[PDB]
Motif scaffolding. Structure first.
Motif, PDB file in Angstrom:
ATOM      1  N   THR A  38       9.162  -5.750 -11.902  1.00 11.64           N
ATOM      2  CA  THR A  38       8.526  -5.806 -10.609  1.00 11.64           C
ATOM      3  C   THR A  38       9.661  -5.193  -9.578  1.00 11.64           C
ATOM      4  O   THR A  38       9.372  -5.577  -8.300  1.00 11.64           O
ATOM      5  N   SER A  39      10.623  -4.546 -10.006  1.00  9.40           N
ATOM      6  CA  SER A  39      11.538  -4.166  -9.081  1.00  9.40           C
ATOM      7  C   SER A  39      11.274  -2.730  -8.975  1.00  9.40           C
ATOM      8  O   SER A  39      11.410  -2.084  -9.914  1.00  9.40           O
ATOM      9  N   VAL A  40      10.868  -2.290  -7.811  1.00  9.21           N
ATOM     10  CA  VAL A  40      10.195  -1.114  -7.620  1.00  9.21           C
ATOM     11  C   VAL A  40      11.028  -0.268  -6.507  1.00  9.21           C
ATOM     12  O   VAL A  40      11.851  -1.049  -5.673  1.00  9.21           O
ATOM     13  N   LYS A  41      10.918   1.202  -6.432  1.00  7.86           N
ATOM     14  CA  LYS A  41      11.834   1.900  -5.393  1.00  7.86           C
ATOM     15  C   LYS A  41      10.891   1.813  -4.331  1.00  7.86           C
ATOM     16  O   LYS A  41       9.783   2.107  -3.947  1.00  7.86           O
ATOM     17  N   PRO A  42      11.550   1.492  -3.035  1.00  3.66           N
ATOM     18  CA  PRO A  42      10.932   1.486  -1.658  1.00  3.66           C
ATOM     19  C   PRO A  42      10.719   2.871  -1.125  1.00  3.66           C
ATOM     20  O   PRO A  42      11.429   3.740  -1.765  1.00  3.66           O
ATOM     21  N   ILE A  43       9.824   3.186  -0.265  1.00 10.16           N
ATOM     22  CA  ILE A  43       9.573   4.160   0.479  1.00 10.16           C
ATOM     23  C   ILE A  43      10.430   4.178   1.531  1.00 10.16           C
ATOM     24  O   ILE A  43      11.347   5.087   1.826  1.00 10.16           O
ATOM     25  N   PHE A  44      10.327   3.402   2.605  1.00  6.47           N
ATOM     26  CA  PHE A  44      10.825   3.314   3.683  1.00  6.47           C
ATOM     27  C   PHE A  44      11.469   1.830   4.107  1.00  6.47           C
ATOM     28  O   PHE A  44      12.562   1.351   4.223  1.00  6.47           O
ATOM     29  N   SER A  45      10.597   0.839   3.794  1.00  5.30           N
ATOM     30  CA  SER A  45      10.727  -0.568   4.106  1.00  5.30           C
ATOM     31  C   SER A  45      11.292  -1.379   2.864  1.00  5.30           C
ATOM     32  O   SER A  45      10.633  -1.242   1.751  1.00  5.30           O
ATOM     33  N   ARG A  46      12.420  -2.021   2.979  1.00  2.00           N
ATOM     34  CA  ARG A  46      12.757  -2.974   1.941  1.00  2.00           C
ATOM     35  C   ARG A  46      11.924  -4.212   1.876  1.00  2.00           C
ATOM     36  O   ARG A  46      11.815  -4.809   0.828  1.00  2.00           O
ATOM     37  N   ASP A  47      11.344  -4.681   2.918  1.00  2.00           N
ATOM     38  CA  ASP A  47      10.321  -5.953   3.105  1.00  2.00           C
ATOM     39  C   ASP A  47       9.211  -5.464   4.030  1.00  2.00           C
ATOM     40  O   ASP A  47       8.837  -4.341   4.334  1.00  2.00           O
ATOM     41  N   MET A  48       8.433  -6.684   4.371  1.00  2.00           N
ATOM     42  CA  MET A  48       7.247  -6.531   5.130  1.00  2.00           C
ATOM     43  C   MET A  48       7.471  -6.545   6.578  1.00  2.00           C
ATOM     44  O   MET A  48       6.632  -5.974   7.290  1.00  2.00           O
ATOM     45  N   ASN A  49       8.724  -6.903   7.038  1.00  2.00           N
ATOM     46  CA  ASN A  49       9.112  -7.030   8.352  1.00  2.00           C
ATOM     47  C   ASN A  49       9.327  -5.563   9.053  1.00  2.00           C
ATOM     48  O   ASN A  49       8.959  -5.242  10.099  1.00  2.00           O
ATOM     49  N   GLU A  50      10.337  -5.006   8.340  1.00  2.00           N
ATOM     50  CA  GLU A  50      10.312  -3.570   8.501  1.00  2.00           C
ATOM     51  C   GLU A  50       9.043  -2.574   8.722  1.00  2.00           C
ATOM     52  O   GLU A  50       8.967  -1.622   9.574  1.00  2.00           O
ATOM     53  N   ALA A  51       8.125  -3.061   7.693  1.00  2.00           N
ATOM     54  CA  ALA A  51       6.720  -2.308   7.453  1.00  2.00           C
ATOM     55  C   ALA A  51       6.141  -2.715   8.697  1.00  2.00           C
ATOM     56  O   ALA A  51       5.435  -1.837   9.416  1.00  2.00           O
ATOM     57  N   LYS A  52       6.204  -3.962   9.149  1.00  2.00           N
ATOM     58  CA  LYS A  52       5.303  -4.269  10.678  1.00  2.00           C
ATOM     59  C   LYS A  52       6.021  -3.623  11.688  1.00  2.00           C
ATOM     60  O   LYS A  52       5.187  -3.151  12.641  1.00  2.00           O
ATOM     61  N   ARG A  53       7.133  -3.356  11.601  1.00  2.00           N
ATOM     62  CA  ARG A  53       7.888  -2.783  12.768  1.00  2.00           C
ATOM     63  C   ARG A  53       7.455  -1.074  12.754  1.00  2.00           C
ATOM     64  O   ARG A  53       7.199  -0.769  13.987  1.00  2.00           O
ATOM     65  N   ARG A  54       7.179  -0.475  11.806  1.00  2.00           N
ATOM     66  CA  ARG A  54       6.942   0.733  11.488  1.00  2.00           C
ATOM     67  C   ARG A  54       5.379   0.878  12.139  1.00  2.00           C
ATOM     68  O   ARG A  54       4.847   1.814  12.552  1.00  2.00           O
ATOM     69  N   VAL A  55       4.540  -0.064  11.522  1.00  2.00           N
ATOM     70  CA  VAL A  55       3.119  -0.088  11.865  1.00  2.00           C
ATOM     71  C   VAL A  55       2.965  -0.283  13.457  1.00  2.00           C
ATOM     72  O   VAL A  55       2.156   0.436  14.205  1.00  2.00           O
ATOM     73  N   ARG A  56       3.844  -1.023  14.168  1.00  2.00           N
ATOM     74  CA  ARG A  56       3.753  -1.306  15.291  1.00  2.00           C
ATOM     75  C   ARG A  56       4.192  -0.100  16.458  1.00  2.00           C
ATOM     76  O   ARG A  56       3.566   0.279  17.115  1.00  2.00           O
ATOM     77  N   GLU A  57       5.142   0.611  15.949  1.00  4.00           N
ATOM     78  CA  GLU A  57       5.581   1.883  16.323  1.00  4.00           C
ATOM     79  C   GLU A  57       4.524   2.983  16.309  1.00  4.00           C
ATOM     80  O   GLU A  57       4.440   3.767  17.190  1.00  4.00           O
ATOM     81  N   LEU A  58       3.667   3.119  15.215  1.00  8.70           N
ATOM     82  CA  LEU A  58       2.700   3.898  15.154  1.00  8.70           C
ATOM     83  C   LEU A  58       1.620   3.627  16.040  1.00  8.70           C
ATOM     84  O   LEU A  58       0.961   4.685  16.400  1.00  8.70           O
TER      85      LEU A  58
END
Ligand SMILES: CCCCCCCCCCCCCCCCCC(=O)OC[C@H](COP(=O)([O-])OCC(O)COP(=O)([O-])OC[C@@H](COC(=O)CCCCCCCCCCCCCCCCC)OC(=O)CCCCCCCCCCCCCCCCC)OC(=O)CCCCCCCCCCCCCCCCC
Ligand SMILES: CCCCCCCCCCCCCC(=O)SCCNC(=O)CCNC(=O)[C@@H](O)C(C)(C)COP(=O)(O)O
Ligand code: SF4
Ligand code: SF4
Ligand SMILES: [Zn+2]
Lengths: 96, 208, 52, 95, 176, 126, 114, 113, 52, 43
Positions: free
Chosen positions: G1-21
Motif C-alpha cells: 500500500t506504499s505507492v509513489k506520489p504524483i505531486f501530493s504526499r497527502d490530501m491536504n496538498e491535494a486540496k491546495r492544488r484543487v483550490r488553486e486550479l
C-alpha cells in the motif's frame, strides 16, 4: 513525336538535351494491352512425395524467447554486435 | 526447412545474449528480466525506477552507444495490475544493433520522463499520455497531442470502445459543431474468430 | 534482397535544406539504378510463400 | 419473374415488398424501386436436366477454374434428380 | 558505397572566379531555367481529352462492385459470407435463407460504398467468383444513400457490366 | 521516504472518461466462455472474459442494419485469472457478477467395457 | 500500500492544488466568455466550473485528484491559449442534447435502459 | 595532416586528438576509481578504457588510430570518451550495482497472458 | 508519377492503395509486359531528374 | 511456364547519373560580348 524539325531543333537547343531520344510521351514502344495467357510456376512444396508439412512448418518452429537473465572472473566486456565497418566511398561517382 | 522457413540467425542470438548478460550484471539494481526472441531481438525488462539510469547507460556506454530512440510505446494489458507496458526501442548505429527496454506502470504511478536522455521522447510519451493516460513526471510540456481538445478518455486503453462515447455533427440551431452520445446506424459487428484448437504447442501454458 | 543490389548512399555536408534536397535527388538516381538491377535480376518462380 | 403488390410495387426476388400502411414507401415517391427482373430461381428452373450414364457425376459450373469448386453428386435416387449445391444444375442417371 | 553530395571546393583561379562572376552578374543559370521552361513550351502536352479520351486501365482494376451469374442466369452467390468476414471495413452485410427450391441464397447482400476501401479482398475471398469489383469508376452520386447498394443494385451492376467483367476475369484468372 | 500510504479503495472512474450512464447502470459479466458444442476443441475455454449486458439493437429505417446506441456492446476483455477480472471491474466502478469456471469432470473410460459379459454397457454395434 | 506520489504526499496538498486550479478557472471564465464570444453569462460559466469541480468531489485518493488537477490544468491551458474553438468550450453545456428521462416511469415509456 | 572536416555537422576537428584522448581516458579512470571494485560497470569500463588508452599510447598516427580504435572518426571517439565520463559521473550517484530494488508482480512479464 | 501509378494499377488494380505486398510475398504475379514498360520508364526518367 | 521475365541478354543500360551538359561561353567571353555591346551602343 509529331513535332516539326524546326520546333524540334529549337526545343533541343533550349533544353540543351537530345529530347527525342528520351520522350516522356509514350508511343508504340510500350507493351500490348492484350497479352498471351501466362503459365505461372508452382513453388517448391508442390510435390507428391517427401512433402510432409511437419518438415516445413515455419510457424511451429517459432519458440518462446529464451530468458537469458531472470529475477525468478576476468570475462571480456561485450557489445551487442561487432563495431560497424566504415563505409567505402563510391567508385561509381563519389563527387570527388 | 530451407525454402519457406525463415533462416535462423544464431550469431546474433549469441551476441545479443552475451550483451543481455552484460547489461543485467552492470545494472542489477533495475534489470528484472533479459530475454532474446527466436528472431534475435533483445529485451531488457526493468523496474520503472530505472528508466533514466538504464537509458542513460545504453545511450552513453562505450560498448552500447544506443544513440537513437527508434520508438516509444505503451501497451495496455488489463489483466496485469500494472496494466501499462512502456516499451523503448533503441538503435545503436555504432554496433548496428537494436535493443528493447520494457517497464510497467498502472493508472496512477508516474513514469519518469526520458526527455533528458532522448529528446525524441518529447512527443512519444506525450502521446502515451494522450492514448493511455500514463503520466510522465518532469515532462517539459505534457499535454494531449492527437485527440480532440475536449476529449475525455484515453482511447488506446483496451476498455475504451472502438467508436467512442461521443460523435460530432453540425447543428444549425446553435450554428455550431456539437458533440452527442454516439449512435451507430450500423453497429460494428464483433467477430469471434479464435479457433478452439491449440495452434502453437511450444507456447502452451501450464494449467491450474 | 537489398544486400544483392548495388547502389550508393548520398551524404550531405552542411545539415541544411539544400543538402537534403540533393540527397533526395540523388536517391532518385540510385532508385533508378536499383530498378535496373531488379529488372535484370528478376528470378523465376512463385510469388507467395508455398505454405498454404 | 417479377409480380406486383396491390400497392403497385414490384416484389423483389427475395419476396420483399412494403405494406400499404408502411411509411417507407415514401422513399420511392418521385423515384423508382430498383428491382432485378432476371430471377435466378426462375432461370435455373429453365435449364434441362442432364441425362448422364454414370452413378456419380461431377460439377464445377463450367469454365473450369471460372466456376465453383468441383463437387460430386450421387444419382442413386431414381425418384429425384441430383442437384449441384452451388450452381443449381441438376443431373439424372439415364438408366 | 556512399557518395558526397555537395562537397566540392570551387576553383580559385581567375578563370573560374570570372566564370562565377559572369554567372552572378549576367544571370546565366536563370537563362538556363528560362530555357528549360521554354523547352517544355514547345512540347506536345500530356493532356488527354476527357471525357472523350480515357485514362488507360488494366484488367485488374478495382472499381464498382457487381454480383455475377453463371451462364444459366443462376446467381453465383451461395451466401457463404466469406466476403463479409474478410471485408476490412465491414462494408458487406449478408443475410441468407433457403429459398423456394431449397438453394442456399442471400436475402440481403448490402455493400456500403462509403465504407468500402475498394481493395478487392471480397472478390479474392469469393470461392465462386460471385462478388467482383468491376471496371466502372464513373458512378458518382448526388446523394449519400445512393452509394448504399443492396442486392438488387449489385445484381443489376452484374447484368449491366457482365460482358466486360467476364472478359477482364478471362484476362486475369491465370494470375489468381 | 518517496512513498506515500494510500489506504483507500482503488477507484479510477473519474479518470477513465466513461460517462456516468455507462458506469452505474451497467452489469459486467465475468465468466469463462462455454465450449462451442459444435466442436470438441477447448482452447477458447482457457481465459476469463468480461462482457456487458446487451442493450437495444434496432432496425435502421434506411437499410435494415442493426443500429445500436450502446458503446460497450463490443467490449470484451480477457483476463488470466478471476481475480484480475474482479479487480479490473472494481477499479472501474462496474457492478459485476461472476460465474465460476465449469470444468468437465473426469470420466471413466474403458474400451473393453463395450464388450462386457453381463453389463448393460455392451454396444449393439461398433 | 506504499505507492509513489504524483505531486501530493497527502490530501491536504491535494486540496491546495484543487483550490488553486479552481481559482485559476474562476479568474478565467470572464475572459473565456469574452474572447470566445459565448452566449452564456459569466455566472453561468462559473456555475459550470463549480458543477465540474463538484462532480469529482467524492475522491479520497491523492493520486487521483492529482491527475484531476493535472487534467484541469491541461483544459485550462487549452482554454487560455486559444486552442479550443467555441465548440469545445460549449461542449460542457450539453445544449443540443435532449434531456434524458430521469424517473422510472418515463424511462419505462421510452425504452429498455435502466 | 590536419583533416579539413569530420563530415559530421557540428563535430569540430580536433587539432591534438592523442593528448585529448589521454586526458579523457585518465579522467574516466580517475572518476571510475571511486566506484566499488566488485561493480561490473567499474571492471568492464576499466577494461575497455585501458584497452583504448593502450591503443592511443601505442599509435602516433591519427588515421591508423582511427582504423584500430574502430569507432569512426577520432573526434567522435573523443565524443564517446566525454559521454563515458559523464556516464560514470552519473553512475556514482545512481549506485546501480546495488541489488534489485523490487521484484515485479508474479505475472508481469508473462506473455501471452 | 502518373505513369508509376499506372504501374501500381497494372500490378494490383489500384493506383495508390494496392494491398499488394502481403505477409508471405506479394498478392499476385506481374502481368506480362509490365517489366518492359518499367524499363521504358527507367530509360527516360534520368532526363526528367536532369531537367528538375 | 510463361512468366514476366527479362529478355535473354537482359535489358540495355540505363542512365542514372547527372547530366547538366555545360553550355555557354566563358566568363571572359561573356564579359567581352557585353562590353562590346556597350561600346557599339556608345559609338
Ligand atoms: C510564329 C507564328 C505562327 C506560325 C505557325 C506555326 O508556327 O505553326 C506551328 C508549326 C508546327 O509546330 P510543331 O509544334 O512542330 O507542330 C507539330 C504538330 O504535330 C503539327 O500540327 P498538327 O499535326 O496538330 O496539325 C493540325 C494543326 C495544324 O497547325 C497549324 O495549322 C498551325 C497554326 C497556323 C496558324 O491544326 C489545328 O490543330 C487547328 C488549329 C487552328 C488554330 C491555330 C492557331 C491560329 C492562331 C491565329 C488565330 O510550327 C512550324 O512549322 C515552325 C514555326 C514556324 C514559324 C514561321 C515564322 C514566323
Ligand atoms: C466554462 C467551462 C469550464 C469548465 C471547467 C472544468 C474544470 C474541470 C477541472 C476538474 C478538476 C477537479 O474537479 S479536481 C476536484 C476533486 N477533489 C477532490 O476529490 C477532493 C475533495 N475536494 C473538495 O471537496 C473541494 O471542494 C475542496 C475545495 C478542495 C474542499 O472542499 P470540502 O471541504 O467541502
Ligand atoms: S473491396 Fe474491400 S472494403 Fe470493399 S466490399 Fe470488398 S472487401 Fe470490403
Ligand atoms: S459473394 Fe462470394 S464470398 Fe460473398 S457470400 Fe456470396 S459466394 Fe460467399
Ligand atoms: Zn455446379
Amino acid at each position: 513525336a509529331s513535332a516539326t524539325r524546326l520546333i524540334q531543333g529549337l526545343r533541343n537547343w533550349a533544353s540543351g538535351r537530345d529530347l527525342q531520344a528520351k520522350l516522356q510521351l509514350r508511343y508504340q514502344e510500350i507493351s500490348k494491352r492484350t497479352q498471351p495467357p501466362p503459365k505461372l510456376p508452382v513453388g517448391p512444396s508442390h510435390r507428391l512425395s517427401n512433402n510432409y508439412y511437419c518438415a516445413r512448418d515455419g510457424r511451429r518452429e517459432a519458440m518462446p524467447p529464451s530468458i537469458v537473465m531472470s529475477s525468478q572472473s576476468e570475462k571480456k566486456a561485450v557489445s551487442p554486435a561487432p563495431p560497424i565497418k566504415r563505409w567505402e566511398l563510391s567508385q561509381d561517382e563519389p563527387y570527388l | 526447412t530451407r525454402p519457406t522457413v525463415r533462416p535462423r540467425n544464431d550469431v546474433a542470438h549469441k551476441q545479443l545474449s552475451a550483451f543481455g548478460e552484460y547489461v543485467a550484471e552492470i545494472l542489477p539494481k533495475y534489470v528484472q528480466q533479459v530475454q532474446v526472441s527466436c528472431f534475435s531481438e533483445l529485451e531488457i525488462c526493468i523496474h520503472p525506477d530505472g528508466v533514466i539510469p538504464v537509458l542513460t547507460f545504453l545511450r552513453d556506454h562505450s560498448n552500447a552507444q544506443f544513440k537513437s530512440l527508434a520508438d516509444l510505446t505503451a501497451v495496455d494489458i488489463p489483466t496485469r495490475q500494472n496494466r501499462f507496458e512502456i516499451v523503448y526501442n533503441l538503435l545503436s548505429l555504432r554496433f548496428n544493433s537494436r535493443i528493447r527496454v520494457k517497464t510497467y506502470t498502472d493508472e496512477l504511478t508516474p513514469v519518469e520522463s526520458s526527455v533528458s536522455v532522448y529528446k525524441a521522447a518529447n512527443w512519444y510519451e506525450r502521446e502515451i499520455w494522450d492514448m493511455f493516460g500514463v503520466f510522465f513526471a518532469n515532462h517539459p510540456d505534457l499535454r494531449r497531442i492527437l485527440t480532440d481538445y475536449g476529449f475525455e478518455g484515453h482511447p488506446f486503453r483496451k476498455d475504451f470502445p472502438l467508436s467512442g462515447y461521443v460523435e460530432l455533427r453540425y447543428d444549425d440551431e446553435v450554428k455550431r459543431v456539437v458533440a452527442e452520445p454516439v449512435e451507430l446506424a450500423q453497429e460494428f459487428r464483433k467477430f469471434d474468430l479464435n479457433s478452439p484448437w491449440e495452434a502453437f504447442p511450444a507456447y502452451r501454458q501450464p494449467p491450474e | 534482397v537489398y544486400d544483392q543490389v548495388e547502389f550508393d548512399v548520398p551524404i550531405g555536408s552542411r545539415g541544411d535544406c539544400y543538402d537534403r534536397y540533393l540527397c533526395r535527388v540523388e536517391e532518385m538516381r540510385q532508385s533508378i539504378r536499383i530498378i535496373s538491377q531488379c529488372l535484370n535480376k528478376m528470378p523465376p518462380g512463385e510469388i507467395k510463400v508455398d505454405d498454404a | 419473374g417479377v409480380r406486383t403488390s396491390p400497392t403497385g410495387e414490384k416484389v423483389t426476388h427475395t419476396g420483399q415488398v412494403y405494406d400499404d400502411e408502411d411509411y417507407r414507401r415514401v422513399r420511392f415517391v418521385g423515384r423508382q424501386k430498383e428491382v432485378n427482373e432476371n430471377f435466378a430461381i426462375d432461370l435455373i428452373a429453365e435449364q434441362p436436366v442432364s441425362q448422364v450414364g454414370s452413378r456419380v457425376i461431377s460439377c464445377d459450373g463450367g469454365g473450369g477454374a471460372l466456376g465453383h469448386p468441383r463437387v460430386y453428386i450421387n444419382l442413386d435416387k431414381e425418384t429425384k434428380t441430383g442437384t449441384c449445391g452451388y450452381c443449381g444444375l441438376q443431373f439424372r442417371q439415364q438408366h | 558505397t556512399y557518395k558526397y553530395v555537395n562537397l566540392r571546393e570551387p576553383s580559385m583561379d581567375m578563370k573560374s572566379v570570372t566564370d562565377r562572376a559572369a554567372q552572378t552578374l549576367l544571370w546565366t543559370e536563370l537563362i538556363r531555367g528560362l530555357g528549360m521552361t521554354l523547352s517544355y513550351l514547345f512540347r506536345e502536352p500530356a493532356t488527354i481529352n476527357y471525357p472523350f479520351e480515357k485514362g488507360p486501365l488494366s484488367p485488374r482494376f478495382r472499381g464498382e462492385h457487381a454480383l455475377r451469374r453463371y451462364p444459366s442466369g443462376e446467381e453465383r452467390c451461395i451466401a457463404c459470407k466469406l466476403c463479409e468476414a474478410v471485408c476490412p471495413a465491414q462494408a458487406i452485410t449478408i443475410e441468407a435463407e433457403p429459398r423456394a427450391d431449397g438453394s442456399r441464397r442471400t436475402t440481403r447482400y448490402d455493400i456500403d460504398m462509403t465504407k468500402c476501401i475498394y481493395c478487392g479482398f471480397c472478390q479474392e475471398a469469393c470461392p465462386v467468383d460471385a462478388i467482383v469489383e468491376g471496371p466502372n469508376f464513373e458512378f458518382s452520386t448526388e446523394t449519400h444513400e445512393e452509394l448504399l447498394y443492396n442486392k438488387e443494385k449489385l445484381l443489376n451492376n452484374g447484368d449491366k457490366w457482365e460482358a466486360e467483367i467476364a472478359a477482364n476475369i478471362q484476362a486475369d484468372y491465370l494470375y489468381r | 521516504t518517496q512513498l506515500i500510504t494510500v489506504d483507500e479503495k482503488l477507484d479510477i472512474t473519474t479518470l477513465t472518461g466513461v460517462p456516468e450512464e455507462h458506469i452505474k447502470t451497467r452489469k459486467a459479466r465475468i465468466f469463462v466462455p462455454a465450449r462451442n458444442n459444435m466442436q470438441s476443441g477447448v482452447n477458447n475455454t482457457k481465459k476469463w472474459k468480461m462482457e456487458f449486458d446487451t442493450r437495444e439493437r434496432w432496425e435502421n429505417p434506411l437499410m435494415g442494419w442493426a443500429s445500436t446506441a450502446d458503446p460497450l456492446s463490443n467490449l470484451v476483455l480477457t483476463f488470466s485469472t478471476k481475480e484480475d477480472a474482479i479487480a479490473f471491474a472494481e477499479k472501474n466502478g462496474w457492478s459485476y457478477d461472476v460465474e465460476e469456471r465449469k470444468v468437465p469432470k473426469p470420466k471413466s473410460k474403458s474400451y473393453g467395457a463395450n464388450f462386457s459379459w453381463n453389463k448393460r454397457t455392451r454396444v449393439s454395434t461398433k | 500500500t506504499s505507492v509513489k506520489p504524483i505531486f501530493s504526499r497527502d490530501m491536504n496538498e491535494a486540496k491546495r492544488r484543487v483550490r488553486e486550479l479552481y481559482r485559476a478557472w474562476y479568474r478565467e471564465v470572464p475572459n473565456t466568455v469574452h474572447l470566445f464570444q459565448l452566449d452564456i453569462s459569466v455566472k453561468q460559466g462559473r456555475d459550470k466550473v463549480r458543477e465540474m469541480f463538484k462532480k469529482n468531489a467524492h475522491v479520497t485518493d491523492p493520486r487521483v485528484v492529482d491527475l484531476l488537477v493535472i487534467k484541469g490544468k491541461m483544459e485550462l491551458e487549452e482554454t487560455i491559449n486559444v486552442w479550443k474553438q467555441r465548440t469545445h468550450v460549449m461542449r460542457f453545456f450539453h445544449e443540443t442534447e435532449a434531456p434524458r428521462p430521469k424517473d422510472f416511469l418515463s424511462k419505462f415509456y421510452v425504452g429498455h435502459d435502466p | 595532416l590536419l583533416k579539413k572536416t569530420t563530415g559530421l555537422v557540428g563535430l569540430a576537428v580536433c587539432e591534438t586528438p592523442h593528448e585529448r584522448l589521454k586526458i579523457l581516458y585518465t579522467k574516466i579512470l580517475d572518476v571510475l576509481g571511486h566506484i566499488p571494485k566488485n561493480a561490473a560497470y567499474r571492471k568492464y569500463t576499466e577494461q575497455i578504457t585501458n584497452e583504448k588508452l593502450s591503443i592511443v599510447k601505442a599509435e602516433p598516427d591519427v588515421k591508423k588510430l582511427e582504423e584500430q580504435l574502430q569507432g569512426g572518426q577520432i573526434e567522435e571517439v573523443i565524443l564517446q570518451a566525454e559521454n563515458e565520463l559523464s556516464l560514470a559521473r552519473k553512475m556514482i550517484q545512481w549506485k546501480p550495482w546495488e541489488p534489485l530494488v523490487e521484484e515485479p508482480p508474479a505475472s508481469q512479464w508473462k506473455w501471452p497472458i | 508519377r502518373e505513369k508509376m501509378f499506372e504501374f501500381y494499377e497494372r500490378v494490383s488494380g489500384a493506383r495508390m492503395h494496392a494491398a499488394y505486398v502481403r505477409p508471405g510475398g506479394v498478392h499476385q504475379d506481374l502481368p506480362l509486359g509490365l517489366m518492359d514498360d518499367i524499363y521504358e520508364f527507367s530509360k527516360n526518367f534520368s532526363l526528367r531528374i536532369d531537367e528538375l | 511456364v510463361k512468366q514476366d521475365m527479362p529478355p535473354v541478354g537482359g535489358y540495355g543500360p540505363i542512365d542514372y547519373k547527372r547530366n547538366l551538359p555545360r553550355r555557354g561561353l566563358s566568363g571572359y567571353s561573356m564579359f567581352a560580348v557585353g562590353i562590346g555591346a556597350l561600346l557599339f551602343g556608345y559609338w
